[PDB]
Every structure is written in C-alpha cells, then in structure tokens.
Design a protein around this motif. Structure first.
Motif, short mmCIF file in Angstrom:
data_model
loop_
_atom_site.label_atom_id
_atom_site.label_comp_id
_atom_site.label_asym_id
_atom_site.label_seq_id
_atom_site.Cartn_x
_atom_site.Cartn_y
_atom_site.Cartn_z
N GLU A 149 4.86 -27.09 -32.01
CA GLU A 149 4.44 -27.00 -30.69
C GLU A 149 4.06 -28.44 -30.11
O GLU A 149 3.10 -29.11 -30.81
CB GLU A 149 2.95 -25.98 -30.73
N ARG B 62 6.22 -24.59 -26.94
CA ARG B 62 5.87 -23.73 -28.05
C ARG B 62 7.19 -23.34 -28.68
O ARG B 62 7.96 -22.41 -27.99
CB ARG B 62 5.25 -22.59 -27.89
N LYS C 189 -6.84 -29.81 -39.92
CA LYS C 189 -6.05 -29.32 -39.13
C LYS C 189 -4.66 -30.01 -39.21
O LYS C 189 -4.56 -31.22 -39.25
CB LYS C 189 -6.46 -29.63 -37.58
N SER C 190 -3.64 -29.35 -39.41
CA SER C 190 -2.22 -29.89 -39.55
C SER C 190 -1.75 -30.56 -38.11
O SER C 190 -2.12 -30.27 -36.97
CB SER C 190 -1.31 -28.88 -39.79
N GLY D 248 1.52 -30.98 -37.82
CA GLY D 248 2.93 -30.26 -37.64
C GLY D 248 4.01 -30.86 -38.19
O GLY D 248 4.05 -32.04 -38.69
N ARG E 64 -5.94 -26.16 -31.32
CA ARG E 64 -4.77 -26.68 -32.10
C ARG E 64 -4.53 -28.23 -31.76
O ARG E 64 -4.83 -28.92 -30.92
CB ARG E 64 -3.38 -26.04 -31.66
N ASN F 195 -6.14 -32.22 -28.48
CA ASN F 195 -6.55 -30.61 -28.82
C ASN F 195 -6.57 -29.78 -27.81
O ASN F 195 -7.21 -29.89 -26.60
CB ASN F 195 -8.33 -30.78 -29.13
N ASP G 286 -11.39 -16.84 -38.47
CA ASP G 286 -11.44 -17.38 -37.11
C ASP G 286 -12.45 -17.52 -36.46
O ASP G 286 -13.01 -18.43 -35.64
CB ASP G 286 -10.08 -17.04 -36.46
#
Lengths: 139, 379, 379, 139
Positions: free
Chosen positions: A82, A77, B346-347, B349, A50, A46, B16
């Motif tokens: 990322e 990034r 939460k992804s 990715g 993200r 984390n 947010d």
C-alpha cells in the motif's frame, strides 16, 4: 466494460488508475525521511494506523514535473503493498467508456506501464496500470 | 468457575482495540503537556490505572501454557519408546510457563522432530544403559521459564551425548570449516554445526521424523521468530538445549537515540551497557576502529555512517551504546540519547524489505514515526 | 488450528474493568466541559468510539452459546421416551445461540422440565397414534435464535394438545376467574392458567415445603430473568411454547427520572405515555388519587408518597409516566426527567430484602447510584 | 492470645473488633438514601468497586449517639459481606492480652455478640464479634 477510475493531474497532463486500488486521498504535509532509500520515494507517512510509503509518480513514469507545485497524496492499495502517490490536483471518480479507450503503447514514452489512453474533447485522461507501477518499485 | 470457548479471530480484534486504547492514552498525554492542565493529570492518571489493569488481563488471555499445546506429546514419546523397545522416563514441566500462540504453533512440530530424533539417537536401550552402570530407565526432560524480555525453553537428557570428536572430522569432509579453525573451537561451537542447514540431510521417509539431528530445522524457525538458540553436550552426561524467544508479540523494549534530531530506536533486550567515550580514545589496528573499555576491546561503529546521515560538527565526548550480536558485541556511537520506552513494531512493507539495517518503523507518543535498528542487520 | 480456553469469571472481571473505563470516560468529559478544547473533544470522541467498540467485544466474548445445555437433552429425552413407551424425533436448531452466563445456568433445569412434560403429556404412544390414524413417530422441535434485541427459544410438539374447556372450567372450580370473564377470555389467554399452581400433578408440586419444578415455575423463572413467555395449543395439533429472554443484564433500557435530585430508573418496555398534568384535574373518588385521561380513569400515584420520603409541599403542574402492568396501567408522578440509557442491573442488597418497590440497584456512567423500579411492586 | 483490635468510642463508651475484619476507614460524604430503610441503616456508598451498606452501629447495639457528632465510617470485612459502620472518633490498633480479658456479659444488651471485656488502663473496652452483629442486620 464501464471502468471507474480516479482522475488527477501532473504538469497540465491528466492521468488515472482504478478505484479498486484506492485507500483515500489527502493533502501533503511533512514526509518522514527513511535513510538509504530509493530515489523515486519521498519517505513515509502514518495513515489509518499504517506506515505508507510516499512515492513520487512522475519519477516512475519519467515525465517532466515541478516538485513544489504538487500537493495531493493519493493513497493506493494492492495485495502486495500500500503506497501513496504525490501529484497535482484531483478531480474524483470518472466513469470511462470502452469505445473511447485506445490501447496503443508506443504513443508516448511511458506507454508500457500505461493500460491505455481515454480519448475526449477535454484534456486526454491517460489510463495507467497500477500493477506494473507497483512491479517497478520492488526491483 | 466455568471454562468457556473464545476463538482466535475474537482475540485478534481485542488486540487491535487494546492498540487503539494505548494510542488514545498517548493522545490525551500529548494534549496534557500541550495545555499544562493540573486537573487533566488526575483524570488521565485514573484512566491509565484502569488501562494498566485491562492491559495485563488482555496479555493473560493472549498467552497460553506450552503443555496445553504439547498435550499429546508425552503419548507420542511412549509410543516411540514402545516401537524401539526402550524404557525412558519423559518429564514435562510446562504448565505454568506461558508462551505466545503464534510462537508456540510454529515451534511445535520442530520440537517434536527434536525429541523424535533424540529417542532414536541419544536414548539408550536397557542392555547398553546397564552396561555403563547408569540408572536403569532413561531420563528425557522438557521444561521452560521466563527471563527478562524473553521466555526460555529448555530440553535436557542423561543419554549417550553427542559424538563431537567425529562431528569436527565430518565437518572437514563436507568442506564446512578449516582444520586449524576446528582445533581453535570450544565444545559448544562443535555442536553448533548441527544448526547448519545441509551438514546432515539424513531422514526417514517411513517415520517422517525430520532431517539431520532434528536441530537445524528448529534453529531456522527460532531465528525466523527473532530468537536465539544454544546447545551443550558431553559423552555419557547427556545433552542440553537452550532456546530463547520474545516475551510478547510486536512489543520491543527500546532505547531511543537520535542522529541530527532523527529518532532511531535500539533494542534493550540485545544490549550490554551504555558509556560516554572520548574520540581521543578511539584507535585502529585493522580496517575499522575500536576502543579499549573495561579492559576489553570493542569494535565501534558510527550510527550516522551506516545510515549515511551528514555529520556537521564534532564534539569530543561521544555517547555510545554497546549491543550484543551472536556470541559477541559491537559498539554503536550515537549523536544524542533521547530516552527509553517500550515501542511496537510497524512494517515498512514490500518496497523496504531489502534493507538489512531496519526491519520496522514505530509510532511515538507525539504521533511521530521512528525506525528501529536491526542489531544483526548492520554487521 | 488454535482456540482459547479461559474461565467465564475472568471475562466477567474484564467486563467489570470495562465499566471502570466508562467512569474514567465521564471524568475526562468533566474536564472537557470546564476547559473546552477541540484537541481533547477529538481525543474523547476517539475514546468514546473505542470504549463503545470494546464494550461490544467484551460483552460478546462473555456471552455463552446455549449448546452445552442443548446437547444435555437428547440422551435424557430418549431414556424418558423409552420408559414412557413412545417414539419421538428430536429436532434441535440454532444450537450455538448466545445468551448470558446467569441465564444459561438458571434456565437449564426448567427447560428440561418443559421438555419432559411435552413428551409425557403431548407425544402419544404408537398404538394411540395408529388408532387416530396418525404417524406413529412424534416430532419435538427446540429452536433458538435472536429477535428484537433479545433471545427467542421455541419449543413445540405434534402431540395431543390441551383441552381448553378443561383449563377454563377448572379455573372456575378453583375460584380463579368469574363466569362471564371466563366466557369472554380467548384461547391463547386461557392456556396461561396452566402456569398457575394446581393444573398439573407431576413431580412434587402440591408440597408446602421443598416443591418441585412445576409448569408455574417455568413461567415464573422466565419472567424473573425479565423475559416473556407465551403458549398456544390445539387438539391433535400439539402444543407450542415460546420463551423470550434478554441477551444480558448489561443493556436494560430505562428512563432515568429524578425526585429530590435522586436517580430512579423506569423500565422503557412496559410504558404507555409520558404526560404533564395539571393540579386542577386531579381528584379523589373513594380511594387514592385518580385522573381522567382520554375519558378513561387512571389511578395516579406520587413516587415520593409510595416510597415514604419527604418532598415538596406545594402544588405545581406535574410530570407523570403511565406504566403498564398485566392488562392495566397506573400513573407514576415524578419530579424531573433526566435521560434514557441502557443500564446494568445489580442486586438491591441483603439488608434491603423486604423492600418490594425496587428490583435492583445500578451504577450509572457518571458513578451515580440509581435504583430500578419494579412495575408490579407499587399498588 | 495476642489479638490486635481496632479501638473506637461511641458517646464516651469504648468498643473494638479485630483488624482481621477491616477493609478501611473513611469520613461520611454523600451516602445515597434507600427508600423504606430499617431504622439502623443510613444508606449505601460505592467503595473499592463494590456497593457497601452504611449501618449505624449504636442503633444495632442499643446505645446512645449523636448523628451530627458521628462522622467516621469503619468499613468491615467478613467472608460473607463488607459493611460500613458509622461511629464517632477512632483511636487505632491495640494489641490485647487474655490476662486482662473477662467473659462476664450477663447484664449486656449485645452480650451474646460480645467476645469479652478488656480491662486495659482503667477503661472498659468491650470486644465485639463482627459475625453475630452482621447476622442481625441481614433481612
């Protein structure tokens, strides 16, 4: 062109990729395991709210490495993804000159995903291509 | 008092900030059980009170009525009734039923093509209406409601109904199913072939009304938004369509379970029950195990197996979670059962998109990451 | 495309609950001061940041663009101009400039009157312009923008302008100024007597009961909303009126002072200095207390005396705040100096209507009540 | 009609107004003083997110009191305003009947602000009207 890259090492060899594709840099602590994951990945962390995957750079380049020695996670990034890269020591931002940049791809065995090699009287700073490195993890 | 304008970018940033406030609530709560302070409980409880009030206010401005979006749609139905020379009454009961703004936008032109094919297909001219003695003006109804962790959109007519008897015969022409399988099926599974892409691709380039019956176009979207769609039809009783979609964006009510002390979340919306089973009652008839529970036989799966986590030692009384998928439901045997809470996806990715088993991480109240099991991804 | 429709009252309620979070923030800071933990100092530092970011967004979405009131003018102005038998170009800029709900609603009718008077007096008919060899179509410009942490609204014409000699001589005739004061006053200062009753006749302004919106009203309303208003005019160069209003009532910068350990706020903008004076210096001439500062004589006042509350008997070296009003400035002696903040002005109350010294109460960040002093309420 | 009223005393004299017009009841703790206050008001407090005035009932009515004995604030509630009334002890909720209710207020100071007089169990409980009492305190 005067390129600004982030300088950092693996196993007494200098490496670097652009500052354009950097989020920040941190020191390693416990990496959360993802089940049934690719072998070139450590897990996920984390960072700034993200979920960043923590890749092991040396297992992508195919170079020799010592896992315990590493302790610096460089978070990158790109538009696609990322991703954090676990490595040795970091220097910071290094302005390189186009005059000293060699573009040969057969000099060492990982030269195709390398953008070039910066020639110098210290340790040779190899310029990587972040793009082709992210292009490897998604296949 | 007075109606004003707030754009979606402003509401996106407010969302947010509500997310950063929920994290700060959890970080004081971590600090509180760390240091065990009686006075800090009171301080936090008051913060948590105002935050609950703020949270539900922010949810109200995030959600929108469906008839605010579908405002031009009864006018379109009137103009298409006029074009085809048909009399039909459109009933729209959507003003009190709120839906998320990203969900409503993706499903609107889909729903428009469903109604547009329906006015052609199932809505009768006046001569054929009064030939069957049916009430002289057609009835086509849109409505909605709220159910648990979901919002239910409902569409119904008193029209022709759908030619199910011909649809199984067409399905055999197209190579869609076996004939002895077609004789096994119940009526609402015949209609489910109208939710198969490529079964009918018929369209009009003049109208631009959507391919097929205007239903496999909608089903793809509903599945894409992680929902679930149903249908029923009977000849000269009309047709009815049921559409279930998530209550809010990103929030997933879950049951946290553990394998070797690693947190894996299980979606409470999909569930059916939770039971402590014996390994001495687990049996097998084909290639995979089962257990007879409540008289019914449930296809058990071992959490630690499908995730490839080593099982060190075996204890007789096992904890199981029964999850629903499609029209059915399978058993998930777990190592420990932590405790429910409502988490936020939460992804992981682009590098982790390939994995069917999990579509998302989530941040727990101790700052720990915990992955969410995908119910239709395992089996 | 999508956008949000919501009542202003709901975002006023979201602002209210935001002000509850400020008190809860102050209760976690109390616990931090007793228990001193870096974890909680960090958690409060993140909460302080989120509350500051969140209060900016709520205040921002609650602010109303003035465009709704602005686009009420062009049709009204054209019909007036036609009946008045003249032709003007209207130029309107800065259209979606944002101000408070209270200010947008109050200012609309006085600004309609300001515009109405500008076409009536200022803008000439075509035949008068052709006689002065001037362009027949007038130019009237209304321009709004942000400046100085406040909102600026400029109104100007290319018209006749105002005779400054008439305004000054009428002020002598109505006994409102002395002859040598009139002869020393500047042009920009003379045109402020336009905003004093009786220098115009239009729309029910001589009335004892049920009075219309005069030009005095326009200046008084701007001031009442805590703003400032300026004028400058010249012959055949038209008239220019500048109105400067605050953004909102939620950011009124004050200096919080205490007497008897009771919080009294002082409006920062008006000030002139803050000085610790000696008991030996203070003297009386033939009226109330004075102090000789910079060789000038300042009328010093004791806060607790002008408010009629019991206070300390014995002399000490006292802290004074010099506040400016009109063209002058008086001294306000206070006991202790708390600390500055941007506060939220609330009503004093309907049992306290007679009190002239306070313009408005307020709830501080620790839940303390603090009244706000009126700069012109003490003489 | 069966009206349910809130019963309370001031200097051994019984009074009451309806439950319809009640917000809550509290004990007086730090009432903020307002400079230049009229004789019948103590000051203001923050309750339920609103700024409530605390009036002293007996100084509106014209009756005796002790200000160290009085310590109960009865907070009222009309469409127009919410105001607290500082008094002595409180009893509680009392259902009254029209049969024991008299309308004679010819000799009373607050007799045109009184709905009546309830002659229940040997006591002389005077029934007030919140509205007309609040119209007097307003400036």
């Amino acid at each position: 062109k005067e390129f600004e890259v982030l300088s950092f090492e693996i196993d007494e060899q200098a490496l670097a990729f652009d500052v354009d594709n950097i989020e920040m840099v941190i020191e390693k602590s416990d990496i959360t395991p993802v089940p049934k994951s690719r072998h070139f990945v450590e897990g996920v962390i984390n960072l700034r709210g993200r979920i960043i995957p923590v890749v092991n750079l040396a297992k992508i380049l195919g170079i020799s490495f010592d896992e315990q020695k590493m302790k610096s996670i460089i978070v990158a990034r790109t538009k696609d993804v990322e991703v954090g890269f676990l490595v040795d020591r970091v220097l910071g931002v290094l302005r390189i000159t186009e005059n000293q940049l060699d573009l040969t791809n057969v000099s060492d065995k990982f030269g195709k995903k390398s953008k070039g090699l910066v020639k110098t009287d210290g340790r040779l700073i190899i310029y990587l291509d972040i793009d082709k490195i992210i292009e490897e993890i998604t296949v | 008092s007075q109606t004003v304008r707030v754009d979606i970018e402003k509401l996106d940033n407010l969302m947010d900030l509500m997310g950063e406030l929920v994290i700060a609530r959890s970080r004081i709560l971590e600090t509180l059980k760390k240091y065990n302070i009686k006075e800090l409980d009171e301080s936090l409880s008051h913060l948590s009170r105002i935050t609950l009030d703020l949270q539900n206010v922010v949810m109200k401005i995030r959600m929108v009525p469906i008839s605010f979006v579908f405002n031009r749609f009864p006018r379109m139905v009137r103009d298409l009734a006029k074009k085809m020379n048909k009399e039909v009454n459109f009933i729209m009961r959507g003003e009190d039923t709120e839906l998320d703004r990203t969900f409503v936008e993706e499903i609107g032109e889909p729903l428009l093509h469903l109604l547009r094919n329906a006015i052609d297909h199932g809505i009768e001219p006046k001569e054929e209406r009064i030939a069957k003695g049916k009430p002289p003006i057609g009835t086509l109804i849109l409505s909605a409601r709220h159910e648990g962790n979901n919002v239910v959109i409902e569409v119904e007519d008193d029209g022709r109904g759908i030619d199910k008897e011909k649809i199984i015969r067409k399905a055999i022409e197209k190579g869609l199913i076996d004939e002895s399988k077609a004789a096994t099926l119940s009526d609402q599974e015949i209609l489910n072939f109208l939710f198969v892409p490529g079964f009918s691709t018929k369209e009009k380039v003049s109208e631009v009304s959507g391919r097929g019956v205007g239903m496999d176009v909608v089903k793809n979207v509903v599945e894409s938004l992680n929902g679930s769609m149903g249908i029923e039809s009977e000849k000269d009783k009309g047709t009815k369509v049921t559409i279930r979609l998530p209550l809010t964006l990103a929030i997933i009510q879950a049951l946290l379970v553990k394998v070797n002390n690693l947190v894996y979340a299980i979606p409470i919306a999909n569930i059916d029950t939770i039971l402590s089973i014996s390994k001495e009652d687990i049996q097998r008839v084909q290639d995979r195990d089962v257990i007879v529970i409540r008289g019914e036989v449930i296809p058990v799966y071992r959490l630690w197996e499908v995730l490839q986590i080593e099982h060190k030692e075996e204890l007789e009384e096992m904890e199981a979670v029964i999850v629903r998928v499609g029209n059915r439901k399978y058993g998930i045997v777990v190592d420990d059962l932590l405790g429910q809470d409502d988490i936020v996806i939460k992804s992981l990715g682009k590098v982790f998109s390939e994995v069917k088993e999990f579509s998302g991480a989530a941040i727990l109240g101790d700052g720990s990451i915990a992955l969410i099991i995908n119910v239709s991804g395992i089996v």
